[PDB]
Amino acid sequence: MKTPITEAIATADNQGRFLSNTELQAVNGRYQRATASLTAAKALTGSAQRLITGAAQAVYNKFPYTTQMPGPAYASSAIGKAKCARDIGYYLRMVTYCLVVGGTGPMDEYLVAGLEEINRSFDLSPSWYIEALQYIKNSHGLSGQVANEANAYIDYAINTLS
Amino acid sequence: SIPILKYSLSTQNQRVESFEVNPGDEQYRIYSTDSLPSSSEVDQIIWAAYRQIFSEH
Amino acid sequence: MKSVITTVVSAADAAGRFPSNSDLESIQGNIQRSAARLEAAEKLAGNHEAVVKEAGDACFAKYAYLKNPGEAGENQEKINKCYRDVDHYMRLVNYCLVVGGTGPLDEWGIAGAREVYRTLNLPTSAYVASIAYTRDRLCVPRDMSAQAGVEFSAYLDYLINALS
Amino acid sequence: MKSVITTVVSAADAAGRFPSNSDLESIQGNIQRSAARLEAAEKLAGNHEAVVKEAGDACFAKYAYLKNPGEAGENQEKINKCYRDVDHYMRLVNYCLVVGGTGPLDEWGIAGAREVYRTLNLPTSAYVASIAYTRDRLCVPRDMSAQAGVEFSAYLDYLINALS
Amino acid sequence: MLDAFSRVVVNSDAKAAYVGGSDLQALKSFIADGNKRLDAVNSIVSNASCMVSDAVSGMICENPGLISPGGNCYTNRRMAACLRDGEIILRYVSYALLAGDASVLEDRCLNGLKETYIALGVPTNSSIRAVSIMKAQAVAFITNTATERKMSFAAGDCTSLASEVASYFDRVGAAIS
Amino acid sequence: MLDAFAKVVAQADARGEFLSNTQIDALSKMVKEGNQRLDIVNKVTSNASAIVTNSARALFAEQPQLIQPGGNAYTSRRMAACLRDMEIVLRYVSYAMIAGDSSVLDDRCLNGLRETYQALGTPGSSVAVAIQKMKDASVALANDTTGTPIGDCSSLVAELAGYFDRAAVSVV
Amino acid sequence: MLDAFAKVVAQADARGEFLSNTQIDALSKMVKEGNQRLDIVNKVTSNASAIVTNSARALFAEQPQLIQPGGNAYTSRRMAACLRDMEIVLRYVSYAMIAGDSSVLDDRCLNGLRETYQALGTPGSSVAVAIQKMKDASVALANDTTGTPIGDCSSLVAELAGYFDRAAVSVV
Amino acid sequence: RLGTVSGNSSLDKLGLDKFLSESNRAYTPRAQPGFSSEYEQIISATYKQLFGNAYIMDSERAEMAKQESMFRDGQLTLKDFCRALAKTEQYKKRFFDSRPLYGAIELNFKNILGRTPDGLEHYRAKSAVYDTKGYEAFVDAFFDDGEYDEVYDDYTVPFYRGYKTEANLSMAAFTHFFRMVRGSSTSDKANPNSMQKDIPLNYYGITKTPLAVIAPGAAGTAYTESFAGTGSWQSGRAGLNAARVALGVPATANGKSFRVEVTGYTQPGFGITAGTAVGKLYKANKLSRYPRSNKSYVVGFDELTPLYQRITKNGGTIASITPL
Ligand SMILES: *CC[C@H]1/C(=C/c2[nH]c(/C=C3N=C(/C=C4\NC(=O)C(CC)=C4C)C(C)=C\3CCC(=O)O)c(CCC(=O)O)c2C)NC(=O)[C@@H]1C
Ligand SMILES: *C[C@@H](*)[C@H]1/C(=C/c2[nH]c(/C=C3N=C(/C=C4\NC(=O)C(CC)=C4C)C(C)=C\3CCC(=O)O)c(CCC(=O)O)c2C)NC(=O)[C@@H]1C
Ligand SMILES: *[C@@H](C)[C@H]1/C(=C/C2=NC(=C\c3[nH]c(C[C@H]4NC(=O)C(C=C)=C4C)c(C)c3CCC(=O)O)/C(CCC(=O)O)=C2C)NC(=O)[C@@H]1C
């Protein structure tokens, strides 16, 4: 994964180098910001069910055809409603994985690589997932540099869908 | 059997040694499968090869 | 058996060699425990009929279905065979303290108990309910010494682990 | 590396079992015997340069035929190796006191020693002439404890019984 | 194979040195805290069967897709092997705690386990979670801080034996990763 | 390659779980160990030419068959590769110190090194001797309190020594 | 790769023979079914996305452990590789329909596909029921007459269903 | 000598020459008193087979005096000698206690039975006896089942048979024989796939994957490869070995496809000259030109002759070419 520690090793192994002060300062910047990152991942984990059911309802108010239109792509059956709240939980879980690691590395490996062929094949549209992630950005209840850390990985997921 | 025709060389940067122990930020990032990369890092080899042969566009 | 003498002699016999210096430090560790282990065998030898009386009906108080028609405690006669079935395992714990190792348990009480208790439809979970009661009823200075209750309880967890 | 720990673990490993109560009682003697056994180990570490000179020189008093041409002690570079061939043996006795058992002697000194002491025509009665001189040039009040000169003397005639 | 005393000797035989006095101070405190080590192995072996049936049940309740048809704990033959795949890990750790060295699980258990597990299709990230639960149960018995069972020891401190056994469980996870 | 923070994330995704509060609080303890970890790595990288050269010179002192004519280390090209191989391993052990786990030591250094040395005829047991002489040359340097606040960091020197044992049993 | 024409030619050069008249006739018979063969390949190609994406959706509905976390098609990297594999099998079957013999399907798609899924951990019996679903979806879709002149076309869909049966047995 | 066509024979030039000569058949029930010069040959032939060309020093042998005495008395080769010898300490030291459990099963198949465990069920049939009954009944299961009695006699030494068609195993277990038994001047400690410390056929023995056979003594006898999976489910790394399939459009373009294995790749001997380069000897990352020896390739037919010249003119040597 792309973490701040494996991208300092890889730039030092590329130059055939021991770990200089260029690389020790970079790992030290991870350890400074990890105090605000590990409380954002603890506060998003503990309030996750409030955020998943909320963010799935925010898609249904905004795009109400997804509950009325028949077909397997839409949240009109009880099966297709549980697969929606499944997917909101997948996106929220990857955001907490990026806060504990630092850097958009877990969702670059588990989520965004091959995502366009999934949305194209099963006829899912990425504007349903932007609306769900814009709810979580506005409703996680964090503040300060703890909200600054969480919102920086919400906006990475939106920029890959937008 | 028609060999290739002879042309003359020219002075270029790569024909001559750089002394360059401990390279810097302009060292240009070897992407190799000799470092045994995982699945997330073989995606970066593939994007680097697309950038080099095709354009970024 | 499996004890401290039978282990260093067999490993001497399985290598064709005389009793070495490390073969004698082990018996030295049997001298430093016999005076802390044979008084656990002394207490159990004179108090067993009150131990199996209350540990035997702690399983019938737990699993009360056994006194049904078609079960393992159908009549009074098959209840008395279970008290005899329990007063063997306390007798073999007494023999493991005397020998020092767990040889008498896993050669007369454990070996073949899976095939027997599956065939005759005897639940092993009621055996370990009668042995876990004894392990918890023990008080350390009241019933034994401070380290005699470590030896006696170390064999009641060999019985429970071997029947599970 | 045979010792008291590696023989009760190999006994438990070859049966697929957890360490029983016998395996823990074999270590309470290893705890007890360690003070006598480690006391002789440091008395031999800080005295080996003088014992090796005394032991190797007792070889060339019973055996003066080694100094002749053609025999094993013909020149001083070969007389020096017999002092080294003995200083190797007192190190392996020092290892057997630190370990506890006779592990390093039969692994590093005795294994294949009869082949080397037959091709090179080294006599083996002059190897036992040195260790047997050390074993009875010994004061258990003075040089060691009383119970450290029984553990130190045991590994010496183990080496003699191996080489004979 | 190599216990705490054989580890010292093979490092002195590399230098052909005598084992003197400055290197016997690690071995004089190995013996002085010898009863605490035997009090530590006794707290694992006495409830080792309960330690395994809680660790692989706790692995399944977290990953319920292991027992689905196609999972790696689906059949009765596969679940029975997992129940001893993790009972033989706890066995070789208690050999290593008894001998004070890791040269028996790294020579009879950990060698070539990662090649064995991906030949069979065993998910390693769940095999580490089963071992990780047993490490939490092990330090809760060395220190007398188990919730459902208190044992009878003397008074004192065993935070060096609790962290030694937690370092024996971490090289199991570092071997199949 | 992975660090210690992504090792616990790759294991939570494989079961589809959020990280529990115990795994978070065990990760924040690794963060406050972070200044003591950067001291150990700085202490090795600033003595790196003397870790290699001294433990090389101490290796051909007790093993003079390596540099005797016919030995594996006898010529200038083979002596230069023995010093490169000592520097490579010490480089990738210090990489696995800032990471926290040995995933970078395993793949891009140690995977296929017993197979490489057996192909060339390098005595792989002598390589394990040289790795264990750079171990106690840098375990001794991380226990040096020169220019540090005197606290306790005995748990990371027991970690750094384990990466040297990992590389030494992997070439024999 | 060979078609039905060059297969018969390649078996004659090994003996050093001309083609017999009974083989020019059997090769001229499949020319007369030329338009009927191109209608089948055009039907499978024109519905290529709907053959795959319905068979996959019907696959995870009955085997839901392939997509629940820790399954072999749980991540969007692995899930897009599963959908890629289903339309590699479909693409090489319709190459074999145009040629007339399974040589392109047997060489560059099927030879070593069982050993590939075994070495990765992919359940090969689940790839068989993913191929069987696309057979029934494309022999029912080559059996409707909308757009084609109604003649008889049953000797060729028994061949097309024979290429799907060849692919589903060489994944286990 | 190597080859398969010279002496109109092919198995004695794979390292099985001296094994194809001996019987060691023990033509009488008990040993005749007065003499030892005939049964000492039977004793030592049993030692070189059951221990697998291992060295046993005369003090190591003298531990096993009792046994050698009962076999010379009125007792038999399989049950009183080969079963007693495998329960000594000189056997358990080298083949049991140094290895994991599957290393022990693979060496008891090689030593006692003379063949290879093919498939996971030959391992599992012998693994389950150890978990319930310890070591001393785990050795019995290699003897007291229905394989030993029908192949070897009561008084014949258990010769090698895992290569021939009578041992009805597989053809993948044919190739696994020439990984275990690498010639006659070799032992179990002395071959580079098991150094008495590991499992020789771990991934290939479980999955029944056939191996390329490399003859002992050939130029390329030092070929050894390390193991890593690939694919993200098993969390593996790409770039170590070559594939064994040749699957895509590169399968049948450029002709049919082969799998080539190279071994000897040093740092001098790359360029189009005869001598090593002089100068810096390494690039700035100072790895190597070939970061590991023993590279393997997947190549078509029309690129086989340019690859062959790239392999040999840069120092490498070809160990095996198998068609894919
Ligand atoms: C629903 C499908 C089932 C499934 C598919 C699956 N396959 C892979 C990985 C690979 N598949 C191939 C096969 C080919 N590659 C080709 O180029 C061609 C053309 C000739 C074929 C036939 C290969 C080579 C791989 C490995 C390379 C890669 O990973 O891309 C995967 C990913 C497995 C992994 O962990 O990497 C999946 C998920 N698996 C299922 O679960 C379904 C049953
Ligand atoms: C907000 C809910 C909206 C919605 C959801 C919906 N999604 C699906 C199906 C899939 N979604 C995925 C996505 C992922 N899988 C992953 O592993 C990851 C990374 C961790 C992601 C992002 C996939 C693979 C599928 C198909 C398989 C499956 O999970 O069942 C469906 C079902 C579509 C179908 O044809 O079955 C729905 C209904 N759709 C809505 O209408 C909501 C607005
Ligand atoms: C009869 C054989 C002898 C004799 C024997 C006595 N030995 C006595 C004590 C004793 N011996 C040892 C060493 C022994 N114990 C061990 O654990 C090991 C090795 C592991 C050995 C070799 C010890 C430690 C002791 C205890 C006292 C001590 O030495 O500190 C002994 C005393 C017992 C008593 O008096 O009641 C006797 C009589 N002595 C003899 O005179 C005959 C010839």
Ligand SMILES: *[C@@H](C)[C@H]1/C(=C/C2=NC(=C\c3[nH]c(C[C@H]4NC(=O)C(C=C)=C4C)c(C)c3CCC(=O)O)/C(CCC(=O)O)=C2C)NC(=O)[C@@H]1C
């Ligand atoms: C930390 C792990 C524990 C704890 C350990 C202590 N144990 C102490 C003493 C002790 N334990 C035993 C039994 C043990 N020794 C054996 O030989 C055998 C069986 C063969 C066993 C199970 C003994 C005998 C002793 C010594 C007591 C005595 O003198 O008889 C102990 C105190 C001694 C010391 O620390 O030196 C401690 C601290 N105690 C704890 O509180 C934690 C939970």
Ligand SMILES: *[C@@H](C)[C@H]1/C(=C/C2=NC(=C\c3[nH]c(C[C@H]4NC(=O)C(C=C)=C4C)c(C)c3CCC(=O)O)/C(CCC(=O)O)=C2C)NC(=O)[C@@H]1C
């Ligand atoms: C069989 C599975 C179908 C079916 C096939 C028939 N097609 C018949 C005639 C026909 N087909 C085509 C189209 C074909 N030629 C091309 O050049 C191209 C692409 C550019 C395609 C797709 C043409 C042009 C013709 C006319 C030539 C002719 O008359 O043969 C045909 C013959 C009629 C009959 O005898 O029944 C059949 C059977 N028709 C079906 O009903 C099933 C569904």
Ligand SMILES: *[C@H](C)[C@H]1/C(=C/C2=NC(=C\c3[nH]c(C[C@H]4NC(=O)C(C=C)=C4C)c(C)c3CCC(=O)O)/C(CCC(=O)O)=C2C)NC(=O)[C@@H]1C
């Ligand atoms: C008691 C609370 C149990 C229970 C016990 C019963 N056991 C019965 C028979 C039985 N038990 C044993 C094992 C025991 N006998 C021994 O001789 C020794 C060791 C020396 C032991 C541990 C055996 C071998 C047998 C069969 C021979 C015999 O009957 O003595 C039994 C009679 C059942 C029957 O035969 O129908 C009972 C009722 N049953 C319970 O209800 C709880 C679980």
Ligand SMILES: *[C@H](C)[C@H]1/C(=C/C2=NC(=C\c3[nH]c(C[C@H]4NC(=O)C(C=C)=C4C)c(C)c3CCC(=O)O)/C(CCC(=O)O)=C2C)NC(=O)[C@@H]1C
């Ligand atoms: C002195 C009491 C003897 C004697 C000794 C000589 N030994 C000679 C060579 C030699 N010795 C050993 C065994 C030694 N090497 C070890 O590594 C260990 C244990 C760790 C031991 C005990 C070996 C293997 C060798 C041969 C190697 C070599 O030559 O250096 C020796 C030299 C004889 C020669 O090779 O010409 C002598 C003279 N000889 C005596 O006079 C008394 C009997």
Ligand SMILES: *[C@H](C)[C@H]1/C(=C/C2=NC(=C\c3[nH]c(C[C@H]4NC(=O)C(C=C)=C4C)c(C)c3CCC(=O)O)/C(CCC(=O)O)=C2C)NC(=O)[C@@H]1C
């Ligand atoms: C449960 C915790 C796991 C899991 C376990 C499975 N293990 C399976 C097979 C297996 N495991 C081993 C290693 C084991 N043998 C040893 O000797 C040692 C260490 C000394 C260990 C850890 C081997 C060799 C095998 C091969 C098969 C055999 O001999 O039994 C297994 C496969 C059973 C089967 O395929 O039928 C399972 C399911 N797998 C899991 O999913 C959880 C995470």
Ligand SMILES: *[C@H](C)[C@H]1/C(=C/C2=NC(=C\c3[nH]c(C[C@H]4NC(=O)C(C=C)=C4C)c(C)c3CCC(=O)O)/C(CCC(=O)O)=C2C)NC(=O)[C@@H]1C
């Ligand atoms: C451990 C084996 C060492 C040791 C480590 C300690 N360092 C402590 C504090 C500390 N260290 C640094 C320097 C470090 N941080 C960086 O960002 C960089 C590079 C740019 C480096 C080299 C700083 C800035 C601090 C202060 C911050 C803090 O308190 O964490 C420390 C704490 C003191 C104590 O409790 O003992 C320790 C232990 N010190 C040692 O004694 C050994 C040799």
Ligand SMILES: *[C@H](C)[C@H]1/C(=C/C2=NC(=C\c3[nH]c(C[C@H]4NC(=O)C(C=C)=C4C)c(C)c3CCC(=O)O)/C(CCC(=O)O)=C2C)NC(=O)[C@@H]1C
């Ligand atoms: C001495 C001149 C050498 C040297 C020799 C060593 N050889 C060792 C072990 C060994 N050697 C062989 C080959 C040998 N056996 C045969 O059957 C044939 C020819 C048909 C030959 C040449 C084997 C099979 C073994 C393995 C013995 C075993 O595994 O039990 C060896 C190590 C012995 C050990 O580790 O116990 C040595 C030291 N070494 C030297 O340095 C000089 C050059």
Ligand SMILES: *[C@H](C)[C@H]1/C(=C/C2=NC(=C\c3[nH]c(C[C@H]4NC(=O)C(C=C)=C4C)c(C)c3CCC(=O)O)/C(CCC(=O)O)=C2C)NC(=O)[C@@H]1C
């Ligand atoms: C010497 C003081 C005796 C004497 C000894 C002889 N024994 C001879 C042969 C022999 N002995 C045994 C018994 C031995 N094997 C065992 O397993 C055990 C105990 C467990 C013992 C005591 C056997 C089985 C044999 C058979 C021959 C063989 O093993 O090869 C023997 C003759 C040797 C020969 O015939 O070549 C002798 C001389 N005989 C004496 O006259 C004095 C009293």
Ligand SMILES: *[C@H](C)[C@H]1/C(=C/C2=NC(=C\c3[nH]c(C[C@H]4NC(=O)C(C=C)=C4C)c(C)c3CCC(=O)O)/C(CCC(=O)O)=C2C)NC(=O)[C@@H]1C
């Ligand atoms: C004849 C039409 C072929 C041909 C045949 C040869 N086969 C030779 C040896 C041999 N073949 C096999 C494979 C066979 N045995 C099996 O067990 C199985 C599968 C169950 C099969 C297919 C094996 C294992 C062997 C080794 C020898 C043995 O097992 O006894 C062979 C050489 C004999 C020799 O080396 O002296 C030949 C000539 N070769 C031909 O030229 C035609 C095409």
Ligand SMILES: *[C@H](C)[C@H]1/C(=C/c2[nH]c(/C=C3N=C(/C=C4\NC(=O)C(CC)=C4C)C(C)=C\3CCC(=O)O)c(CCC(=O)O)c2C)NC(=O)[C@@H]1C
């Ligand atoms: C020195 C203490 C010991 C020793 C070393 C030695 N090594 C080599 C040769 C090679 N070492 C490697 C290893 C790597 N190359 C890499 O790029 C990496 C990073 C992934 C590693 C770990 C390789 C590939 C070679 C061969 C290429 C080369 O020759 O440089 C030699 C030279 C052997 C030769 O004959 O060329 C030597 C001498 N040898 C000793 O004796 C010491 C014990």
Ligand SMILES: C=CC1=C(C)[C@@H](Cc2[nH]c(/C=C3N=C(/C=C4\NC(=O)[C@H](C)[C@H]4CC)C(C)=C\3CCC(=O)O)c(CCC(=O)O)c2C)NC1=O
């Ligand atoms: C899905 C089902 C499910 C379970 C079964 C439990 C399983 C479980 N138990 C513990 C944790 C533990 N488990 C034990 C085990 C035992 N205590 C005893 O008294 C007995 C001897 C033995 C059980 C038979 C101990 C001693 C601890 C640590 C202290 C404690 O939590 O009690 C942990 C550790 C947390 C971790 O680090 O991962 C887990 C997962 N939890 C679950 O979610």
